[PDB]
Point group: D2
Chain length 391, copies 4
């Protein structure tokens, strides 16, 4: 059972040394008592023996073991933030002449890494609609090396049909590296590796940390891809500090109870918005009628609290200020996955500009909500007051 | 005066809010009270306004301001460790078809980033002897983009003639990006940017942290190179956590008093070793006769505590164990720059293997020492007991 | 609603400075820019102006504000742990010749403070049965200064009729200081100050921290008692470090979701145990028939996850090992309030020895359970396997 | 040598587990794998076996070992701050009817604990001049239980003739508990236990932490007094958090280099002030002619950087502002022991009010300086500019 696993993952005596949680071992230098101990540590430098702090300490090994257990992987690489995990996990598997095929709903920094970093290093990127499914086979080139998924998509929340995408990729290019940014699911509401994806990447910054006060990325790989991920990310110096690794392990323990609340509250808000006369569309994976909802219901074991909706009109700048500047409980900030509720707005052309080779299908202003842990009726009252400011 | 600057750098009321040290502001989300505040934060997202934790919080801004003041730069980028700072600072300035010209005494992970990451991305790397001086001009190619210095060199401690190298580079390729790994000097005993180097990179892991318990990299750039460094490292998601940024600022405050002790003690050990019948050579920048010592004396304002020496014979494996396994005060570990003294050994062929296109000029076993804060006479007694184990 | 209050309590811009959570301001020295500022800080040194780290920094002020809001107090004093809060809060109100009246179900260290510290300073202590209700009036002596409640009681979980106790005290000794150790309710499931109690004390170590990795005590007082508590605790040097204050504020944000799960799961376990053939009695305040349950139902707004039960026999030392050593999910440790489930045994004679002037009314071994966040069916299977080992 | 001891104290493999520094083990709950292990931990709960977080974790045990080694004690008790260490160490040894004899130069909160807390618990306090020496014998009453020393004295810096005081106490009252607040010497420049003092108390807040960002008290006792100190402080719930214990151990490692610089710089400043036409008197234990200097020279192995001087006039409120508000490098704050230089003024009548049963022997404003790690010529220029503002 997931709740029991979240409470126990990575907590073994060699890391906890008698406490409930792993010790915090802060280190660059790790000491070898003898030459033979140094040789053993060198051989096992990526296999959980203390060698050098860039490879990790007991605190990192504990987190890595937890992530491998929960996401069903062979190894877990750590990074300073989610964006670093995306950029470096892609970089680890490409070279001049390769091609990446990425969903057009990918998180904008992920897209910008491809267009602004990879292109000038000789790696091209092509794009696909998130509902392409089996038809992705027609986009696979002789040089396609990586297929990059993000489900639900950023901002607009479209859910892929992962089984159809994976089967089509494997029919054409069985050896391709299929990766997913699995942040919205916190890596646990969608068991990516069990679907035949090779690497599951998360911004642990979001729900794993859970409190908006730490930044970290993770990437959990299957056995086929682990050694390359591990060693290439290490060549770029990617690591996280021991204290944030500790706080990530700590966040796991309450992830189940948090996610259930985020699901219950956000689905109630989505259902209410869907009935509201000032709302044109709700984009929530769990809401019937949302893009790819059928795949969410089939393939996921729950929802988190992030979603968006489209208003029945395009707000003017004055209406945007009247709306956003006067909330009592929702606040404006980037990121998500914490205990508090957040709100942001984007005009349609802003979204179109981050949908490469595509246009958007709406004209109202888009509002992205994160539903936190506040009482849902208080949140509904805040949204209702917002609607009254723009009616 | 440097000691007064180290005590005060980056400590302004907007960061300290009444305490001596900067507050620790842990954040991903940074909240905007109004749409106009969000627009202002966006415009100033790289200029010290709170925007998103990947760009930094007050704690990072304080450290960045300190580093810019102490190294005389226009901006300071932060990284999870020194190796990440090297890899990502080089990556920030290259593209397919470019060439990097790196000292053959560069830190081995820096070399391996070039050969194992850059090459397959279409960026070639050539090598030079650290004492090449003005003759580096003959190695500059039409596509040379970056010239990468490390002075003193890793392990073998050769000091470049930076003025001669910089003048020669600027005669041929005035726009080239000249970078230095300035870790041994802690960025303060050698004021790289004042010599016309564009970017000074450090493993703040070493003397800035000063206690062997935190990992972090920094890169301080001049005005010409800052925007590209900043934005390209950010596209790779490079950052450090707020707590390690705080501990780095904190380390600065004692850096002067620590470095003076490391200099005094390590020079005394070097002078003693130089007279010892079991020592063939001492490689210490401050020791007369060491490679590039004249440039150290001219261009630096002090020494740190890391150096090496070559024994009068090649130790067998049994002698290596008898020597290294039985020290009372020195301990075996990687890294350096902390309060404790460290020892490691390398055979000549191990060094030759990390001296690309070059051979070594010694045949004895090489011993690398970090001289910490212990009483120097106790350290000398420990080294003497070691010599007696192998005589 | 409580959930919204928990998310927002103490989070004002002067403390958060742009982040979601309060900054962490680590300090002894707090700097005065001018003599005028030092004078204002001195006058206001107990009123939330930065003066000296022993009085607090911004991080402490934010926690204190949150605690006063959630428990409805005039001030909140902070302590290194719950036991320090109990000892120092009682000490702050007694003088030689005074008498303390304490429930005989008080936490053992609280009793030991009375019998081993207060007694030698001329302060006597008497005891009362937790169900005494209005009959406490007959035990109040002319010198009774403090009446000390703990509901539910430690280990055996008896719930006091607080309204009846308070009304009796105010009839006989209106000036008495009534205090409660309100740890089981996390200060929020029982609003002690609204019942006429003067001071609500908590080991924030337990549910407020919520992860078994910090220790801290709190004492929230009404306006009548605040100045004496604040100043006398300060004369004993009582404070908490800024980082643990931060972690306590952070624990508040998930306290509602956590407590609801602890209540649900623990009540299911208690209901199962109550029908179990190897169980003689279940002590859970939320279970009908438990001692004081009617008062829990009337006076509390929920339950936490700590409770106990009595086996149908006293286990020998050998049987205790067979039972306790072989659990798969429950662990043996002191404390409680975290994400993991805990088990501890107390023999009936052990409890009798900490029930002064009273006998126990059961003969089997008492098992105290903390029900964490694991799946409850997994926990029931672990208990069932335990029963099979002692049948 | 002390420097080697400071680098190594408390750093045993059972605490460091492969890193240079002790692990940080954050805990309330400490898990017992078996009933046998719980019994052993219970028996040894005050003897360094993991039992419960209030007794300590590995991180505390490492600090305690280091303090006992450096101060030559049988045990070290830890407290939330220096004032808690003083208050609780005295409380641990008194009972109603006892008498405390304290130097009239004691830190004001120490005096206030005696007059405002102990007095109402039946413990009386008398006072002695710091230079009383052997004449203290005449003040010892039959009920004198504690003799409390502080050398140098707070603010005015008078050094006691400890040998003469201790010998007199042992002649009249050999069983008395002799305690010293040894903060100025950081416990290491004056080896109090070697002088026959029973307990050496320190605000580790000051030089041990060394960076003005943590608070912690310590009390190191001889074998005669340890059990009573340990158990009675524990009954008051006194402890420190694991992270601050880590930072205190970490501060030890640089304490020698720091103290040497504080001594050098502060003595240079004191020598300059002593010749200055606007200075009436300099109180620096290392300056010839200061009160008790001969005892400092005989009994201490160095100086720290805190001292004071008396101006040639008493400054009015307006003059205090002109002087103190306009320093460029010195800051106004309480505490001391850190890397930065501090300035505070005390008017002669303010000092007289905290010299019980005594008068002051100076008429000018007293300026207390903490000399940090800044360049001393810069600090002298700042003082000189201050003198120009009040001439
Ligand atoms: C926030 C986000 C990221 C980036 O994570 P950071 O820790 O902010 O760098 C990656 N993927 C998704 C889907 C995100 O929303
Ligand atoms: C240690 C070292 C580095 C790498 O720093 P990390 O923080 O260990 O990644 C970089 N340069 C030099 C010269 C080094 O010695
Ligand atoms: C745990 C306990 C305490 C003591 O708290 P600490 O933080 O462990 O000192 C106080 N009251 C109750 C009811 C407890 O169970
Ligand atoms: C600062 C001070 C203390 C009190 O220490 P805190 O940690 O501030 O409580 C005790 N003794 C002396 C001599 C001091 O100067
Ligand atoms: Br599930
Ligand atoms: Br094609
Ligand atoms: Br399949
Ligand atoms: Br599959
Ligand atoms: Br779930
Ligand atoms: Br963003
Ligand atoms: Br906007
Ligand atoms: Br509504
Ligand atoms: Br200099
Ligand atoms: Br050429
Ligand atoms: Br020049
Ligand atoms: Br130049
Ligand atoms: Br220097
Ligand atoms: Br290495
Ligand atoms: Br070796
Ligand atoms: Br010697
Ligand atoms: Br409510
Ligand atoms: Br003043
Ligand atoms: Br206990
Ligand atoms: Br010495
Ligand atoms: Br037991
Ligand atoms: Br004070
Ligand atoms: Cl975002
Ligand atoms: Cl190294
Ligand atoms: Cl405010
Ligand atoms: Cl307990
Ligand atoms: Cl050991
Ligand atoms: Cl002070």
């Amino acid at each position: 059972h997931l709740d029991t696993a979240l409470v126990n993952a990575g907590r073994r005596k060699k890391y906890t040394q008698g406490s409930v949680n792993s010790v915090i071992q802060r280190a660059s230098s790790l000491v070898f008592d003898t030459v033979e101990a140094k040789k053993h540590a060198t051989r096992n430098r990526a296999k959980g023996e203390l060698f050098y702090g860039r490879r990790g300490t007991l605190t990192h090994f504990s987190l890595q073991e937890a992530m491998c257990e929960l996401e069903g992987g062979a190894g877990c690489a750590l990074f300073p933030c989610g964006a670093a995990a995306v950029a470096n996990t892609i970089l680890a598997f490409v070279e001049q002449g390769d091609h990446v095929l990425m969903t057009n709903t990918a998180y904008e920094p992920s897209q910008d890494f491809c267009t602004k970093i990879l292109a000038k290093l000789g790696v091209t990127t092509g794009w696909f609609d998130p509902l392409i499914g089996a038809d992705i086979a027609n986009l696979i080139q002789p040089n396609t090396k990586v297929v990059f998924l993000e489900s639900p998509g950023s901002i607009t929340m479209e859910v892929h049909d992962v089984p159809a995408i994976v089967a089509a990729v494997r029919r054409v290019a069985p050896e391709a590296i299929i990766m997913i940014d699995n942040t919205w699911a916190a890596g646990v509401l969608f068991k990516a590796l069990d679907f035949g994806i090779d690497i599951s990447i998360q911004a642990a910054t979001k729900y794993l940390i859970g409190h908006s006060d730490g930044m970290i990325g993770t990437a959990v790989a299957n056995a086929r891809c682990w050694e390359q991920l591990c060693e290439n990310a290490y060549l770029m110096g990617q690591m996280i500090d021991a204290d944030t690794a500790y706080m990530t392990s700590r966040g796991l323990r309450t992830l189940g109870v948090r996610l259930r609340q985020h699901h219950e509250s956000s689905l109630r808000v989505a259902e209410w918005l869907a009935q509201h006369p000032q709302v044109a569309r709700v984009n929530h994976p769990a809401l019937p009628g949302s893009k790819g909802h059928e795949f969410w219901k089939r393939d996921f074991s729950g929802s988190s609290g992030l979603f968006s909706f489209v208003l029945n009109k395009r707000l003017t700048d004055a209406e945007l200020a009247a709306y956003l500047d006067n909330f009592s409980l929702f606040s404006m900030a980037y990121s998500w996955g914490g205990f508090e509720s957040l709100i942001l707005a984007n005009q349609p052309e802003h979204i179109a500009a981050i949908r490469p080779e595509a246009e958007v299908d709406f004209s109202g202003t888009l509002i992205r909500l994160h539903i936190g842990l506040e009482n849902v009726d208080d949140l509904l009252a805040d949204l209702a007051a917002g609607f009254a400011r723009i009616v």
